[model samples]
Target chain A: QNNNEFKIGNRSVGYNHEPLIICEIGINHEGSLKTAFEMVDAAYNAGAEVVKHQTHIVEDEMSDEAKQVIPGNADVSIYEIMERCALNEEDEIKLKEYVESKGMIFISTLFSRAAALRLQRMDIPAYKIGSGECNNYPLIKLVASFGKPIILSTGMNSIESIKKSVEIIREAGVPYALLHCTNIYPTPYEDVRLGGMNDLSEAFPDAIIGLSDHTLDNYACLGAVALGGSILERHFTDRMDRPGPDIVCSMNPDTFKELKQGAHALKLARGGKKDTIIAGEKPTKDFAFASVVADKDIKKGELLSGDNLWVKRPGNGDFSVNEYETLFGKVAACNIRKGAQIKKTDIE
Target chain B: QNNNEFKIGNRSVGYNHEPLIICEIGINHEGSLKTAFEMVDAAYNAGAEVVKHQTHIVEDEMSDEAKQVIPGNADVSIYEIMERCALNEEDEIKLKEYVESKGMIFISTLFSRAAALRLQRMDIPAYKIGSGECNNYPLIKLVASFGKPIILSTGMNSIESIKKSVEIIREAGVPYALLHCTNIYPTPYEDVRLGGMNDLSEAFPDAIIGLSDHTLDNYACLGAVALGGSILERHFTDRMDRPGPDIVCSMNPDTFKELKQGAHALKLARGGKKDTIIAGEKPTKDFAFASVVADKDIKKGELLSGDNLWVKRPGNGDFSVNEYETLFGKVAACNIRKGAQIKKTDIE
Candidate 1:
């Protein structure tokens, strides 16, 4: 296995492959399996092959003190929000089956030991470590112990801190990918910091690199793809009218399709040298490129000068604009009609 | 002046400046001064600061053979097309004045010596040499001789062929930018070859590079911006309903604005590392990251164990998840209630 490449389900992710666009359903379904299934259907309809959900076991994931911790994006305390948003084990199992039945790869962010154990038992093909757990060495190690492919989002963690976590994953020998991310919900486009992919690539050359973006639109995602990010994860919602902190930053079905197509297009558009002519450009070049031609009617034995020779189109001529200067001192060996392409034999 | 950076009117262009987006209104005006002025008004209203026009002096620009050269995108021969589209010198002069009055920079592609001389007399700040002239050594030499900044489009010409034209501009000692282009009108995304920018950069290290795209959307342009192309030119029209061979590939006002904003956003998102924490993410991190906490009440002198201790959120706690392993065997020095944060003093 190439250290910089890995297989998640049937899709290979690396700089060599088209970027894998992940539609992160997260908790935008708001704890309803019906909403969750519908959102999955929407993601599927939008041409998504992978969807990420968040698995939260509130009691096992957070302390009561979290009840006093209100986040910037929501007024509710972290503990209560999770308690209300966490899907039961049975519902999650059903969701996973539903996802697989539709031929989509199902992955989830494990928020605690119980959550991690739950997904492990479900035998998911890969594990996604959320941005908040980037520096959670214990959780990172726990998930790596499961021996599944790991996609880790690094946000709010310093490079030095991440090095320690990367070391742990290295020791585990699991195929892994690191995603550069910014934790602020609805992240300002300027804050996306796409160059981090370069830093990650330089520091951990063996690991696959990608982006988990929270920017308001698909622009950052396309930019990331151009910069060689092979996995793109963004929060997604069934519709823009959905209720959630991430909804404002979430892409709907239409935007999701746009991102998928744009990413694919960009992948094709990027990377090729200007050293050769494209096969597609032949027909266009015939009428577009300028060639050398007689500016007016000329008699035999007439000396050609700038007054009687010029550059114009129908590029199939024997003399191109490149030969314009070379023809300046030559004599016309035959009578040439006005605006006629100059032939080599017509000049002597 | 740095060879890689140059001034066009009042705008500085290079990797160091915001990309200059040029809305090329080529022959979309269909030979009407009124239509040209109206299109310029729309471009300005849509937030464009620069607009490009095509100066086609038909009689002086093409040969009679061009009348028989029908392009793939148009039914009429190129000669009749330009004949119908070429703006009169008086009208073009008026158009330039009108463009400047709208607080926009005006530039045009010079098709022949006559067209070049017309713009020269108008004293336009910079010269744009079309892809057709990229290998037209004589015309390139003449334009460079004017001592103004020149932007040359390289399409249908191989890298080896482009070298000759680049040498002419280099010897003229004038600032110049080279644009990578695909000659086909409505170039397919896969054929855009955005990688040509890299090839051009490697071959001509001293020149500024950009993209002249004919793709259907702005994806390639944004990808170009991310790759450090500081100038982007796309065919444009006031509305999609406008009639022209170029209209099929043109960006109307709405798409132009989208490109402008997306280009700006991608520029800001492009260059940064994940090694540092974003100030915007601080507030979110407070409640998002998990910290070490007591799973249950514990007496003084009781050893901390995995059964009674765990990681949870409200990251302001004294011990973080990174310190979780170190605390595994530490003795509690005080009575820690269930869900209480374990402090250094309490752990000792």
Candidate 2:
């Protein structure tokens, strides 16, 4: 009924589709193409359908002063950190192809217009705009003008501020999803606020809503799935022992695989409409449901009461427990054996 | 805004209340008060707020023919099973007091009119009508007529049938909670259908909704909590080594405690509004949000451009990410060094 569904490398994403789980390798590859290749392979084996990379061109995106600013999550300076960890254009191209070779969708976060243009040159399927760049209009405007699709994360900005970015993306007529995120590294479970996904769904009814979890555990993501998150992303690594600021919050293969299973289960479990007797449960119902039965042998013409009637199993009886009251004052037309299921014919 | 809240003894329940955790020691005692006492101690130690025991009077509930009926989850005949497991009236009273002495609320499932009367005589805070008795109007009317708050399990009947029982409870004008349950032992995650609880919430907006889970894992209950389940009851045993049909589906102390922690966390994380920035994250926001910065050395009076300006972190700066576009064409008001945090006076 709506256009919430989007595509990235031929896979359907969003409402009613299987949860799109992305492993955000970010700068965890440490600028080594070999490390990126290994992480992509691990993510694929972990059942991740998408692998996200951060396309950071240090010189083009930051100034020399950025080298002195350090983030709380990391020990090194921001510029120096990106300089050491960011994959160059050529290696990223090779890694994207390698990730594609593994049958996974490859996406990247563009931090600047230069990075966006670099990805545009590569003919990227879609762009993921990180929370840090959500308000970068010059950059968002450039990416939206490309008219592919976008997945925007909201972490530090208010909805009022985010609306400007959404308007640009919308004017370009691109498919998009909005993610509710908390920017704190190793976010506390208390800060997850899963209901935020519901807020996004209600406020942007036509947009596919999801969560970008920063918590170390999958419980928050699983809760998000329960709350109607269709696309879920988490920082990920092949080994927990790896050195990186995001590593503390990143999920290893086992936990990542677990999150996929939980998300899929939660999606399937969110069945619409309840209380119907489904066909699949009929067999179990036949025996598990309680049925009206005679507690003892009763003579013909005997008045039924709690003393003469009770409920038992193998629900393949004439009446179910719901009908037990119908026979309370009724007369039995035939002699009933002990434990015999009571039928409407037996009790007129 | 609604009257979904209920009271039991001293604990308040329902909307906005922390999930009421009940560890069901139902029939796992195998007719031993010693085992029941041990379980009560274990449940209390595991942080259970309430401990539930089944009050089953075989003759009063099931007939002699029930000896021939075998349930899908159990190998023993239903009658013989309850005959062996149902604690007698005297010991049940003793077990109730013993559970209470451990600083836990004690409740029991009503399986028969006499058992209901027995619990009524003991002044039980509430009555839990098992799934088997859900549609047994005669038993329901009797239990409801007791005027105690009731928690009814709906596992075997459809909503239509459950409505009849609900009407009886309604007629009695007592506080009530409805539990969405699947009768199968170790119910598949699919069948647990936590979403069905939402169906009940909409269908009966005035009543408390909960889950009586039969699944082997705690995830279902966590999902239920995420979906606004106010009451959560899980079958609990002190040891998996104990012999019982329900043991396979029961949680031990450690897992039960984990379920409690997750449920409590979920309640705290269910923030009322999603988009509004809460005060707790202000510190993290101060450092994590991006800020506009000089990408290179800029002369006083030079217009900012992609080459002169960019966004960086350590967000406690003169301008945030949102103001980056405002500075694009503005003349630099002062000579600025590369990578320095931007000040309003530095650009006009």
Candidate 3:
């Protein structure tokens, strides 16, 4: 075994375990703790094992420069959007408690020093470093110092730049996962670049691999699981009717159900070679496999030829098609009628 | 590049090519050539580049034992089902011509010597040997002798058994592809065992690999493409309301459309790692990535420390988060105001 695995709140995450789906409610609750709790409940019902939130201390996270920079996905400046969507520290603590009470793991993406410290005080089992912060070395070092497992989203950073962050996490001696992600909100299917997960696996052989997808559907996530992605993280919302920049990419309850079922199914189907016939195929093989039989009447001591011998089903004969070529020059030990299965005793 | 690819009637089949989806009409028309042509038209409209049919010569394909063997998926005996569904040679010829008339490649799965000979006479561009025939060395040798490309389905047979048939195809020196398949009709998602395709790719490095799926949806096929499966074969039908042993597992026109779009999307999203910042991510990075800034007012000659300077966005400053660690203990060249972007000159 590769031993390419880690744990998040007692849940095993790797090739050896079932896919760990992280329903990321990242500010999707629109700053309302009530809506956040509702999304968590829906995610749990939809088969989410981990619910992720975004810990944003707007003032600490960005400067006035961000106030003038509007994101491509939204008309508002990035600063204004985070301030509007960010949950207060008090509300976030309650939200985490509520998630845990419902038997789910609570994790959050730390956007700044204050946010990281707050999550650290709460003793988060694992820390998720958002894609934007993957190259943020100081923040990473601060979070890594907490001595908890980490799931780092690598989106805009290159493999070269990610190496710097990985070194920090490694120095901290914490278990970690590298997630391949595209930073575009509601990313186009062609831009998903799912193979980046394979790149992560190759670059960091010890790190568990996964995908933080922003695509509009489950196709990329489903593909990620088949490619040995142990973790699948996607934006989540209670309903699609809600308004937010992430809403277009967020999965509703029904879509979440499909993702869980489809990812599991793909995972189950993902390994092993057709080394031999499995139990499920035996019945079909009985009638489907062909066996060597006398193509026409043959007298005793007559040599079997293509004209006299052929292969047909059902496949219970002493000799199957594997023997078809070898029996061409053999003499018939006894008279054989047309369409009769050839046994070893009948051929000499 | 691995060069793990091949061609079928001008269309490339391999990791490098756009996924070649074979919409298998496989007795789905219920022996009516008219219905077969209609299904072909629908498949073309659904973006299918190739269509596959099944050639069954009942008397020559099976013996009396088949009469007593009923398939698990159907109430009718295996012999009766094929007998009722087999299209006569004349009708099959017309079906082939009609399919070609519409600018689509026409292919068929050969079940017996008679069936192979008929297809050979039709001057078909390639030959498809069904799973049952994969281990039928005599049949493989006959088909391989035609000097056309062969697509073999490995379902009930073992890799060891398949080797014998592959040896025959190799000796004949024909282009070949192996499809990992489950023999069950409407196979359970768990039984799909898609990992078998990877095994095939490793075992037969020279052969193109694919999946001949029986699952009810497009999940497996989408995953297959992501796993480097260049070909996707599924039972296709004009409508889902029809009656047949394979109907429950077949993909309707709508489903077929989804499969093509989804499979192609997965293919486009399949390769390449996050080796560097891509053109698509530059805009997002501008506002999302953090830069070093003075957290508080600092006087000239003041040594920058973590408390006075930190990382924030937008990332247009001379120093980014990557430089945050090195900035500590550096002397400030001049007075810096709180929230001021840090530059190389300002940090001295």
Candidate 4:
């Protein structure tokens, strides 16, 4: 845990571990247990390592004044939206059981202290703090004190201001990751700032870096993995045609599977020391590489010239194409047939 | 031109410019003039910057021995394939006119001296040297003698050997781009050393770096763009259902369109300095960020505690949530109402 490496149920997440892809099924269920169940099953089969829900207790999470302002990603007030989307205690417990029964770790973002305590009661292995609460020190302190892995989203906060928050999480001494995020709904690809993962890694070398993507597709997600982001979170749903605010940013089942496969591929290609080849590519090398060959028939001791020497396929030869330049104007020591692969022994 | 910054016809391709995406319709036309023309139209409508063809004169390019050797990606002999696919000079001239008339830059890979001369007679802007020709210094020297830019693919050669070829292009005094490619058809993602672009860039900083992708999709291409690639090439056909050896690595029109859009988007997100926010996201900062707010009423000189202070949305306040930690145990200098934003005047 010293390097911010920890487990979310059975999956490890850190610099050296495979990125834990958490499908953010955040309230896209639209108050239906059936929809939530379907989404869990869909993401599970799509190879998601974790399925995350958003736990909101309207009275504890927000004051009545929050109803005065609606978020840009939503059509309704924050309070009205959360109220309509929030599940009760019994429903959440059943959802938890339903998710775990499908063999996936269930986690959620806690918007308030009350929400955190309830999730703590559920024996959740970790917690997520939304970008809104990244600098909510009191809440961050409360959650960190719980001694569970925390994934913190830093979106609306600047790095200068986040020093203290980073210090708080470190002081609490729990495994944690900082997810570089942008709050824009259906984020423009240019605004995603996938480069911020590098910045976060440089600034907090011990903290695991991640991308909580709001892009309209999985391109940025796959790119982030290649750029060294070890945790990826995306809003997900069963269908995009459904009526919900986040549907614009939510990926359906097929794209979810694509992201998983792309992530696996990228992880395989990510890190390697330079000037080396993989073992599997050797077969292609012998056939694909070029070799110096006779461009025409030549007699013994005939000097090689443009009309008599060139490069061609089936790279098995005494001299490689790299030796072609050196062979220029050199005397041939034997009679070589036209189209014959040149041998170093036959060139002087 | 010395700095590897040069034009391909009318379009600029290098680090300081947009990536030049080439649609290589190599033999995917399957020996049909009508099919090639239809593909040029499809690629243009799909927003390709260049429509590339392959100039193959089987008699001039290969010998009888090649007939006994079939390529790994093709079921037919190399000689048989090239013989069937080689377009007549008249048809190629007609095709070049059609592509230019559609406002697309016309280019092709030249496999023989006659092929290079014909493209040169057509006044083609630059020549694309296939991976097969990286070590063919004589041909490279011949093409470079034409005084045009070159896009060279280095797949089967090691950097040690590529150094000699680079020296050849540099001596010819023409601009060039080195495309890091893997020659395997339907290249497995793990075998794609996208980081090899870095090796090529460092080894030959004067040359621009690009990717000639054989991956199953555009994910690797998009990743390459984000890593500073300024050129991309892919085999392209109008339909994936077509029967051809190259079709397995070829992208249909829709995937080609996706690659163009993704490359553009990835290029936009590529480079940045540090610790800066896009001006467009500033409005989101104002509303999405949290500020300190009084959880309940506090009389003048009353000490603030966990019960009396919290953080909430709409960040227009004298102090930010970053100040939340400093607000603990501070005495209220003025009366603060419940849910009212705390200010420097109200706290000391």
Cα lDDT tens digits for candidate 4, B202-241: 8888989988988888877877887778899889988888
Instruction: Write one digit per residue (lDDT tens) for candidate 3, span B1-348.
Output: 247666787888877888888999998888877788889989888878899999999999998889999887888899989988899999999988888888999999999999999999998988999998888888888999999899999998777888887888989999898988998887887777777887787788888888899888888888888888888899999888888998898998898888888787888788766674566677689988999999999999999999898898788888988887688999999999998899888967
Q: Rate the local accuracy (lDDT) of all candidates.
A: 0.87, 0.81, 0.87, 0.81
Which candidate gets the maximum TM-score versus the true structure?
3
lDDT of 1 at B294: 89
**Tens-digit lDDT track for model 2 on A312-348?**
6556678877677777899899998877789878877
> Model 2, range B278-332, lDDT digits (tens) per residue?
5555644554456788888999999987678877665667877777777778888
Q: Individual DockQ of the candidates?
A: 0.60, 0.34, 0.66, 0.40
Q: List candidate 2 segments past 4 Å from native.
A: A1-4, A29-47, A63-77, A97-103, A241-243, A279-348, B1-3, B29-45, B64-68, B75-77, B241-243, B280-348
My TM-score estimates for the predictions, one after another, are 0.89, 0.84, 0.93, 0.88
Given the true complex, what DockQ would model 2 score? 0.34
What ranking emerges by DockQ with the best candidate at the front?
Answer: 3, 1, 4, 2
Worst 10 residues of 1 chain A by lDDT: A1-10
Candidate 4 versus the native: TM-score? 0.88
Which candidate would rank higher by DockQ, 1 or 3? Answer: 3
Model 4 chain B is weakest, by summed lDDT over 10 consecutive residues, at B271-280
Across A1-348, the per-residue lDDT of candidate 4 in tens digits comes to 125577877778875677778889998998789999999988877777788999988766665556776777766787788889899878998988988998888999998778899999998988999988877787888999988888999886677656677888889998788898887787887787677777777788778888898888887887777776789989999888877878899988898888888788877666443356656445455554567789889999899986798876656677776777688899999999888888878877
Q: Local error of candidate 1 at B122, Å?
A: 1.0
Alpha carbon lDDT at B249, candidate 1: 91
lDDT for model 3 comes to 0.87
